[PDB]
Design a protein around this ligand. Structure first.
Ligand SMILES: Nc1ncnc2c1ncn2[C@@H]1O[C@H](COP(=O)(O)O)[C@@H](O)[C@H]1O
Ligand SMILES: [Mg+2]
Ligand SMILES: [Mg+2]
Ligand SMILES: [Mg+2]
Length: 303
């Protein structure tokens, strides 16, 4: 099927993006550009990874809609950046029948070529993900997440980097699902984009621990691996490419991702990019957290 060949291609493409991300650091010049402010950055890895991802997808799927974070002038793309492979192991998995007839022109791909760029520049390398989300009829249905510096500090016997993928109806793959210890409320949130509304919303959850880490992809991986019980970000700032692939993986293991009002996010081609009402995500016990978002904070954000 189109969908599963897409997913298999996105897996190999994400890995190539992860290689580019690691090569940029290995070579030592990040080419940092400030966009709106000093915490809103774009590096040579953001730009090269996006060129790689988008070019490689468009070559294979010429009528697909592809939407990437970075606003890059249209240039020659370096042909070494093209990834032609697709991981045959994913094509061994049966496409769910509900998706088996989808045409490429009806799919929307939401790409964050490097998520956690501020942290990447600061050396918090394992916060970084590459996000490729696939949506149909406004719903996020499949996703690939590369974590190019997974195991960066695990020592010399460990595999560096990993790729996680999922398709709703088949589940999600590439990690060990774990829950936080019972009765413990561990809230994860932004490290670099905090404000009073964000920290007040965190405080309202009566946290046992608050983690401050970069990346939307990274924080969803914290939920699925039992490092945090809730991701709580009561602020605009993140966009559909930050949430599309991560929500697929979270949904695939029974979790929930919504705005702070409890609305599901939408992923149609023409949807506004901003997640203007923030993000609330959990693996389990969603209602504990949702029921504690203060009304003042809800009223401070809209769609
Ligand atoms: N105020 C902001 N400005 C720019 N990007 C943001 C902002 N808030 C969140 N993001 C993005 O949303 C994702 C998750 O945010 P964080 O938890 O701060 O890493 C990352 O891409 C951030 O760069
Ligand atoms: Mg950004
Ligand atoms: Mg990014
Ligand atoms: Mg991002």
């Amino acid at each position: 099927t189109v969908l599963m060949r897409l997913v298999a291609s996105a897996y190999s493409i994400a890995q190539k993006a992860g290689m580019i991300v690691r090569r940029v650091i290995a070579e030592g010049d990040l080419g940092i550009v400030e966009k709106t402010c000093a915490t809103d950055l774009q590096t040579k890895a953001d730009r090269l990874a996006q060129m790689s991802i988008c070019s490689s997808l468009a070559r294979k799927f010429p009528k697909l809609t592809i939407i990437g974070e970075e606003d890059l002038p249209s240039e020659e793309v370096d042909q070494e950046l093209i990834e032609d492979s697709q991981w045959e192991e994913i094509l061994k998995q049966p496409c769910p029948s509900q998706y088996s007839a989808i045409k490429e022109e009806d799919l929307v791909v939401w790409v964050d070529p490097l998520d956690g760029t501020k942290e990447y520049t600061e050396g918090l390398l394992d916060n970084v993900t590459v996000l490729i989300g696939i949506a149909y009829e406004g719903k996020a249905i499949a996703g690939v997440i590369n974590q190019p510096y997974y195991n960066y500090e695990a020592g010399p016997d460990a595999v560096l980097g990993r790729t996680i993928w999922g398709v709703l109806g088949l589940g999600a793959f590439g990690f060990q699902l774990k829950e936080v210890p019972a009765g413990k409320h561990i809230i994860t949130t932004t490290r670099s984009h905090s404000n009073k509304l964000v920290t007040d919303c965190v405080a309202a959850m009566n946290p046992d621990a608050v983690l401050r880490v970069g990346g939307a992809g990274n924080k969803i991986i914290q939920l699925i691996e039992g490092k945090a019980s809730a991701y709580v970000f009561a602020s605009p700032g993140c966009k559909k490419w930050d949430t599309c692939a991560p929500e697929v993986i979270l949904h695939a293991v029974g979790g929930k991702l919504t705005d702070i009002h409890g609305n599901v996010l939408q992923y149609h081609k023409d949807v506004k990019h901003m997640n203007s009402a923030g993000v609330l995500a959990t693996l389990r016990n969603y209602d504990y957290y949702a029921s504690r978002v203060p009304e003042s904070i809800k009223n401070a954000l809209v769609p």
